[PDB]
Symmetry: C2
């Protein structure tokens, strides 16, 4: 399915857009799952009590609320049942008492999304997340984990000759990496008011998202006390202005939403590898040139920007070949 | 030092409050460190470029931006030194700190460890932390308690100075003079309910919530009745870089934190646990009791209570809300 999410500084507006987007897509015949985190606004706006299990609220529209506590407890039931395939040690430890640590919360939620996607029951999964750098870190897990494996397995394996999962693991992560890089499978839209402070924040998130390979398909401009045409601030992306939702009337907002799928398909690609011209082009808007560092300390080239690091896995064509050069150009970092 | 932070759904308002609180405390002579995340608003509001190292912008006022990449690079070197002290044959010495990728969880851990180091340096009276103001902030602040539960539970299934390290963090988190947060919200009912939910979630980790800062919006209203018994302080906006009116309207954070409700008290004579849990219904709170431990789950946080002798081994006979407190009773007969 398509995992669709929103980045922006204000949670209330993003939850409203997620709800409207789900209502819109459902009414168009798409099978939709709307998923939110542990917070009261989604339930209240929907006038429906939510649970850790999907609930039908309209035709083609189901809604669920992720609770880290419950996802952890359900995964625990799987680890102790596996305690068979390998005397038990963790049987006096009950799922109800497990404590969610930072990081676990994002891994649990991404895995729940993965399960819903894998189920094939939905065309679109609208994720009402935190809409910030933390959502980006979560979405980039496949890539990040793949890199830790790729860089460290060698060091441990080829060092301790004193003492297959790799395929099973790399395959699992690659399938997540593949999906994430495909705009038909994962896309996010920026949400902001005309406040210069919100505009600079989402431009920064836009760039940070390109660093993890997340396509940003467009910008949704919501109302505020500051007026302004944001088009030139987000070129070449479409900025779609939308109205508020008051007193349960979702029609104006629903009718103003953009065509998510089309805009994601037309947006810039986070990364393009040009075999013929032997180069890699990284879309990096929303940063200051001096805020992008390119270095090669390990096997791969590291691109640092937006407090995110990208270790470029080069294909056979570019493999080993020295970096003849690199430069910026209309928000793209071109490396030769 | 007092670690002071703010919880609320709007980042720009929270950053403005954190900046004004820092300016105010530094102007009164408190040694202040204002620490923000890797985001462009703090630097812009202060009209100052920020870096991973504190920079003085006014007397008694330093500002620093936590960049997870840099914190990770810096801890990595400590990992290397450890490898050289504990291994005769290095293995990760090759990997440069600059190529490491930040994983979920690392950001919070690195951020809390940096705060712990500033706090341990003794150079500050207050560290104003401009974080995400949400459930992830709560999960970060409750790390001492969470790691302590793993260490103990997952060790009895068979690290000395470990408990000393964690304990210090736990003692600080529970002390209103050491760690406190204030809610920030407009009169919008959706924001009010989000903040009340965060308020109860904070109580679950033992984080004192000292009060409420009410900021402007298109919706007006008196919020006092929605946050009893907390003081709600109405503050003006900041325009043209004139911080003075906002600064002049801020409450006395330290005093409000000391007067706020206590997340938990145990009455050993009547055999009851009293938990302050505003923002939650009986339907939204689950209790589990295994042996000498009771788990309270609410607001997607879990408080694990190791029962003292007066309560241990006694069935729970009641768990009822009275004026925002959950009173859990234990069997006497």
């Amino acid at each position: 399915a398509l995992i669709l999410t929103f980045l922006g500084k204000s949670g209330v507006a993003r939850t409203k857009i997620a709800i409207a987007a789900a209502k819109l897509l459902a009414s168009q015949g798409k099978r939709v799952l709307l998923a939110g985190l542990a917070e009261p606004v989604l339930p209240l706006l929907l006038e429906q009590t939510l649970t850790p299990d999907p609930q039908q609220i309209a035709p083609n529209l189901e809604v669920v609320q992720f609770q880290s506590s419950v996802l952890l407890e359900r995964n625990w039931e799987e680890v102790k049942k596996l305690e068979a395939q390998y005397t038990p040690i963790i049987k006096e430890v009950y799922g109800q008492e497990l404590v969610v640590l930072p990081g676990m919360d994002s891994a649990l939620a991404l895995n729940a999304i993965r399960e819903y996607d894998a189920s094939g029951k939905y065309d679109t999964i609208v994720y009402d997340g935190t809409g910030d750098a933390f959502t980006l870190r979560m979405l980039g897990l496949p890539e990040s984990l793949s890199w830790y494996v790729r860089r460290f397995r060698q060091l441990f394996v080829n060092s301790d000759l004193g003492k297959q999962p790799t395929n099973q693991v790399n395959n699992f992560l690659d399938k997540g990496k593949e999906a994430l890089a495909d705009p038909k499978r994962v896309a996010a839209f920026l949400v902001t008011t005309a406040d210069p402070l919100e505009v600079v924040s989402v431009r920064y998130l836009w760039g940070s998202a390109q660093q993890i390979g997340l396509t940003i398909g467009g910008v949704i401009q919501v109302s505020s006390q500051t007026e302004g045409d944001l088009s030139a601030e987000f070129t070449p992306l479409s900025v779609t202005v939308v109205p508020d939702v008051t007193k349960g009337d979702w029609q104006p907002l629903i009718d103003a939403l953009p065509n998510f799928v089309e805009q994601a398909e037309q947006a810039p690609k986070p990364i393009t590898i040009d075999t013929h011209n032997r180069q890699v082009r990284l879309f990096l808007p929303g940063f200051d040139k001096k805020q992008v560092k390119l270095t090669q300390y390990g096997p791969e080239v590291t691109v640092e920007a937006g407090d995110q690091r990208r270790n470029i896995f080069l294909p056979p064509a570019l493999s080993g070949r020295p970096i003849t050069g690199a430069k910026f150009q209309n928000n793209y970092l071109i490396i030769s």
